[PDB]
Amino acid sequence: MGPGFDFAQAIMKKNTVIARTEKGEFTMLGVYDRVAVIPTHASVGEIIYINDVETRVLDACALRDLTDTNLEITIVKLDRNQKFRDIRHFLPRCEDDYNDAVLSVHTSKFPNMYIPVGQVTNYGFLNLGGTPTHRILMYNFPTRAGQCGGVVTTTGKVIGIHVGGNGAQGFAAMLLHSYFT
Numbered sequence: 657m658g659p660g661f662d663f664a665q666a667i668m669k670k671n672t673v674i675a676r677t678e679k680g681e682f683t684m685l686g687v688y689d690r691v692a693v694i695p696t697h698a699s700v701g702e703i704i705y706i707n708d709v710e711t712r713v714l715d716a717c718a719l720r721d722l723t724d725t726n727l728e729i730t731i732v733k734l735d736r737n738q739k740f741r742d743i744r745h746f747l748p749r750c751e752d753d754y755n756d757a758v759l760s761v762h763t764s765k766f767p768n769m770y771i772p773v774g775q776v777t778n779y780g781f782l783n784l785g786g787t788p789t790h791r792i793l794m795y796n797f798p799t800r801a802g803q804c805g806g807v808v809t810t811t812g813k814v815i816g817i818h819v820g821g822n823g824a825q826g827f828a829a830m831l832l833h834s835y836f837t
Contacts, residue, residue, distance in 0.1 A: 660757075660772065661772075663758075664758040665760075668760050675698065677700055683760075683806045684805055685807050687743060687831075688739075688742040690733055693730065693731055695804050698730065698805070706734060713732060713733070716733075717731045721790050725788055726789045729817065746813055749833045750832070753777055755775055755776075759797070759803065759828075760807045761807075766802050775795065775796070776808065778793065793815065794826070794827055798821070798824055799826035803821075814831055816828030816829055
């Protein structure tokens with residue numbers, strides 16, 4: 657509808673796949689080469705489905721900060737025959753707050769879904785499903801099951817992936833450029 661939705665759509669149409677694990681279907685962001693991200697609660701194993709094709713997992717790393725605290729981001733290298741467009745130059749270098757973000761989801765349940773979530777707070781610490789978690793972004797939208805893995809963008813920046821909600825607020829894990837060197 658406007659330039660925020662324009663940037664979000666450009667990311668969805670080239671840099672997402674539908675990932676299926678034994679824990680469900682997730683929006684999965686491809687970042688560069690065969691490297692993608694997914695919430696750590698997806699419990700990626702040795703095999704994953706990518707757009708309903710059986711795909712070997714070459715590497716999966718559940719990130720933690722240097723306090724050894726959960727970040728809720730898993731970096732997956734896929735045995736896929738095709739590279740992603742390199743979008744690392746759209747990743748923030750530091751923790752920050754943002755204005756006027758969009759959360760974008762693409763699954764079998766929610767295809768072509770875009771949500772203007774407004775202001776994004778650097779929330780920091782969250783007890784996420786009982787797990788202490790750092791580098792959490794918060795937005796005041798009532799997000800629902802099916803949105804985990806959704807991509808959070810502003811114009812020109814890919815800032816996080818949706819990992820949870822409390823019925824009134826939604827929470828994303830930060831993406832930082834330093835995760836993908």
